[PDB]
Write a protein that binds this ligand. Structure first.
Ligand code: HEM
Length: 400
């Protein structure tokens, strides 16, 4: 018999908005932790319950150091991160805070509020274009990706004129199935950002990269390679997460037409619906990895120093002790306290930007394209694997 008490992890989704069978199994198994086997045969722990996930994400004994040999890499592609200097996502205190603080001023509530006109312009512009062209369209390449791309590039000071290059590099990295393809995509982006830094040293300019070059880099308070990695992190996260939330939300909303109609009739529901979609779709388990630097006892189970732990926020978000009937999409529920953005010192820096983008995107689609519908059946879509950010390669749509 082939039964194991340490199942292969991660698993791939067969439905965009449902837990893989293996994950539903882990969700139902008692206790905060479960053993899994990673692609390389190493055993790690997964965290599968909501409160335990918050506790462990808050535990400084669980390090985010991706350069540690014992870090729970889930594919050969993940060997691209550990090669070059880490952005603050891969740092622990105190280095984490000193670096994160260099970027936080771009993401304040006041700044995000001030960005609304820009986001609305960008959303409606790419919609103007896609709609004028007429159906059939790929919602991913014509809308879901370029919108957040343009927005984050403005925030960063990355010239949108180079979009074909850096969007392809982003796409290659996210779709990477091996180490060499990931390393090449990373190096391509790194060289591009390196040249941008030199350009800023000659001629100062707007955007976070411009500011970091003029200030911290000029004071030697950040390494050039660290600045590259930081800009890269913000660029890729800025592009890829919102793109996936857009595509998957459209698919999910169209599969729940009663809720989608309700959303259209009462736009005050949009912010709450965005939270529920974030909870339900939980696109970023790829960002729950940790390595124990000391023994941690968790409700009778022992995590040993040197063991990998992955906090699986999609499974945690389906904890029925927190969300009644957790596998039901309910745009009227309180999806508050969800872990789609993590918890603690590494909680998503871009979360409020993401929330603004998704609110504007959903309102715009309901306003401008009320007849939007998929042009192929949901079953024909190709979902990305559990080793990357959740999403679809392409999303064929049509409308009146
Ligand atoms: C759209 C939905 C998004 C989801 C579901 C999401 C998810 C996550 C998660 C789970 C983490 C925690 C990683 C960890 O604990 O190791 C994270 C961190 C982070 N995210 Fe987001 N993200 C989204 C959008 C964005 C956007 C639009 C940006 C803009 C740049 C962004 C930038 C970041 C950064 C810089 C971090 C690292 C924070 C730190 O380590 O201190 N994310 N995100």
């Amino acid at each position: 018999p082939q039964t194991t008490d340490a199942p292969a992890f991660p698993s791939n989704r067969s439905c965009p908005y449902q837990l893989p069978d293996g994950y539903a199994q882990l969700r139902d198994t008692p206790g905060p932790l479960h053993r899994v086997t990673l692609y390389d045969g190493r055993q790690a722990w997964v965290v599968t319950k909501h409160e335990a996930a918050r506790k462990l994400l808050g535990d400084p004994r669980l390090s985010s150091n991706r350069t540690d040999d014992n870090f729970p890499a889930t594919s050969p592609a993940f060997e691209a991160v550990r090669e070059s200097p880490q952005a603050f996502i891969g740092l622990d205190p105190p280095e984490h805070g000193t670096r994160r603080r260099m970027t936080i001023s771009e993401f304040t509530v006041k700044r995000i509020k001030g960005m609304r006109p820009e986001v609305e312009e960008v959303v409606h512009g790419f919609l103007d274009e896609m709609l004028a062209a007429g159906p059939t369209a790929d919602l991913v390449s014509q809308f879901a990706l370029p919108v957040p791309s343009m927005v984050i590039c403005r925030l960063l000071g990355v010239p949108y004129a180079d979009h074909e290059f850096f969007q392809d590099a982003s796409k290659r990295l996210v779709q990477s199935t091996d180490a060499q393809s990931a390393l090449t995509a990373r190096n391509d982006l790194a060289g591009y950002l390196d040249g941008l830094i030199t350009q800023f040293q000659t001629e100062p300019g707007a955007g976070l990269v411009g500011a970091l070059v003029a200030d911290q880099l000029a004071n030697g308070e950040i390494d050039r390679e660290e600045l590259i990695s930081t800009a890269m992190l913000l660029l890729i996260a800025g592009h890829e997460t919102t793109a996936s939330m857009t595509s998957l939300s459209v698919i999910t909303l169209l599969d729940h037409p009663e809720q989608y109609a309700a959303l259209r009739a009462d736009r005050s529901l949009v912010p709450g619906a965005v939270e529920e979609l974030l909870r339900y779709l939980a696109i970023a388990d790829i960002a729950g990895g940790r390595v124990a630097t000391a023994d941690i006892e968790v409700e009778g189970q022992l995590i040993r120093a040197g063991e990998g732990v992955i906090v699986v926020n999609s499974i945690a978000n389906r904890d029925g002790t927190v969300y009644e009937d957790p596998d039901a999409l309910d745009i009227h529920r309180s999806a508050r306290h969800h872990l789609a953005f993590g918890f603690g010192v590494h909680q998503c820096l871009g979360q409020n930007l993401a929330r603004l983008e998704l609110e504007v995107i959903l309102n715009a689609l309901m306003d401008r394209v009320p007849t939007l519908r998929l042009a192929v059946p949901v079953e024909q879509l190709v979902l990305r694997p559990g080793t990357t950010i959740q999403g679809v390669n392409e999303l064929p749509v049509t409308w009146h």
